[PDB]
Amino acid sequence: MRRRYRVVVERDEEGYFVAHVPELHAHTQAQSFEELLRRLQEAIAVSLEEERAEVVGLEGALEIEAA
Template identity: 45%
Template sequence: MYIMKRKYKVSVIVEHDKEGYFAFSPELQGCYTQGDTYEEVMANIKDAIKLHLEERLERGEVIPEIDLVSLTSLEVEV
């Protein structure tokens, strides 16, 4: 039996500070990870998202889908 796989597009936010990298997906509550390098955190979040989606699909839950995410930074003087 052939099971057709589906691709999902999810947003990922990556933050960097002196302790390393932190990544999370805003629309997948509780889906986050960390890593020492950007490459490591991206591989980790991809694995975390895949596991998160697999679990939700097994439970018959709806997977939120996004079309566009825009993130920017803003400088504010106070």
């Protein structure tokens, strides 16, 4: 099955991540980007009562902090 969901990801002071998928009323957190993606996919799968889910794409805006 195919789905598209708005998502908001933020990195805290510790550099840890928290993602919010409003349409699914879900929140997921992780210490790395790799971990975030994995938990996000697992969480979306559970929401949809599916065995597995995979992020095949994302279109959005990146917030950058440079020095």
